[model samples]
Target: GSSGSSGMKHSGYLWAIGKNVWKRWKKRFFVLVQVSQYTFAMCSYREKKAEPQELLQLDGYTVDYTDPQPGLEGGRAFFNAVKEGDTVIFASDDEQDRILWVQAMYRATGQSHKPVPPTQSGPSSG
Candidate 1:
């Protein structure tokens, strides 16, 4: 019952601030679509039908949940996608959406090899 080609893995609108001069936050359309069997691209568009304003190849990118760093504006949900020396910051509507976006990015970039959670063991009273 869905439409369009299936290659589009995830798409949504996220509040973002660029790495340079455009430091103001604005909500834009973000897409994580597969480009090749093992590659993907993250593109941002000013509007749904408009050309991409920014595009980042997710080849070597790794995304992580981040806290508000000094000098940067804080938000209800924040995360960053980084590749070597480059990084892009984004914010979701809330915590739940933040987690979804982070997970989607990880999957797209093949960074799904997540670390195991810390010990979930019984209390030690020995």
Candidate 2:
């Protein structure tokens, strides 16, 4: 028998646009984790610690793959989260990683990913 603890969904350095300087991107360690079967949260920090700079509930937020601001190049990975009327832009090192984060965010928010049919089973399967 084999069993393992399911750890956090994803964690890495994601550049967050600074509040003081909207043009400046601040690299911070961000964590996306599932707190419970039905709960998820996103927390970020300047450094890893017991406490995070901010712990944002993953609910009530919609993740958009489209970039929200101008002057940001297409070569970089970019996305935004909109909650109520507030928007937070996030950037990853590359587009691949950005796609991963977007998908994870979608799943955490109870939204299904784009239609991907499951066809791994044989026709004789019960």
Candidate 3:
């Protein structure tokens, strides 16, 4: 089930350059753009104007942190974005970046363990 996810020839604000495992886990260039709170769009980061873009929803689906295994080449830091019976694994060289991306996705789903909301009940009022 899709969460809420957008468009062709689209320019995005919240976007990241990450690698998604697409066949043989070759670390292909994949970029994800936030279309809305409940959805995100992705595409091949390459400048190829042939392939179509894709939108993914993060509603009922599951996102999990995983230890990367790129064979004997050494493990990588990555996560899994799974929906239905299909799964797409995204990897990042930086652990912080990978974590932040997961947190953002969790926030989009309005998950309970998500980051602080816009309205924070703190002392600072700025």
Candidate 4:
């Protein structure tokens, strides 16, 4: 498969180990946070969940809930936030459901990591 650093044997082992660790911690952290969202906020407690409620109601972020799919609403919001590198946290009564949805979004995004580019210099030359 695809390997980063070192040879296939070494990289494959490292990737497997790292992925295992991430999976373990992700599950544990989901419980601790009470809810998790993949794009911006990874974890949310009872207090933080309200923020998402407000965000969802905001004019720019609203999604139609009349037609329901698995993650149609949250996925739209999450992807929008991802494109803008903005974060929102929402309070959820169903923490387990929220965590599962977030995990699904994480998977759907193809789990790619691209570093945010640095800002460009101004017109005034140094």
Report the lDDT tens digits of candidate 4 across residue range 1-126: 333221110000000001212221111122211122222222212244443211121112211111122332222111222323333332223333334444443443334542232243434536
Clashes of 2: 0
For this target, which candidate reaches the highest TM-score against the unseen true structure? 1
| Candidate 2 lDDT, 6-115, residue by residue in tens | 34889988776533223356676788867666567777755545666666666856665774367644336677766665566788887678778887887777644331
Can you give the lDDT of residue 60 in candidate 1?
68
Native-referenced Cα lDDT, model 3: 0.49
- Global lDDT of each model? 0.69, 0.65, 0.49, 0.24
Ranking by lDDT: 1, 2, 3, 4
> What is the per-residue lDDT of model 3 for residues 34-94, given as tens digits with 9 covering 90 to 100?
6665555555554466664444555644555654534422124456655656566666665
lDDT of 1 by residue, 1-126 (tens): 334243787678877666642356777677887766667877776655767767777886777777655544545677877767777777877677777777767877877554222232445547
TM per candidate comes to: 0.71, 0.68, 0.52, 0.22
Task: After superposing candidate 2 on the true structure, give the runs of residues whose Cα lies further than 4 Å from its correct spot.
Answer: 1-7, 18-24, 71-75, 111-126
Candidate 4: which stretches are off by over 4 Å?
1-84, 113-126
Show model 3 residue runs off by greater than 4 Å.
1-21, 48-60, 69-75, 109-126
Best of the two (2, 4) by TM-score: 2
Q: How far is candidate 3 from the true structure (C-alpha RMSD, Å)?
A: 10.1
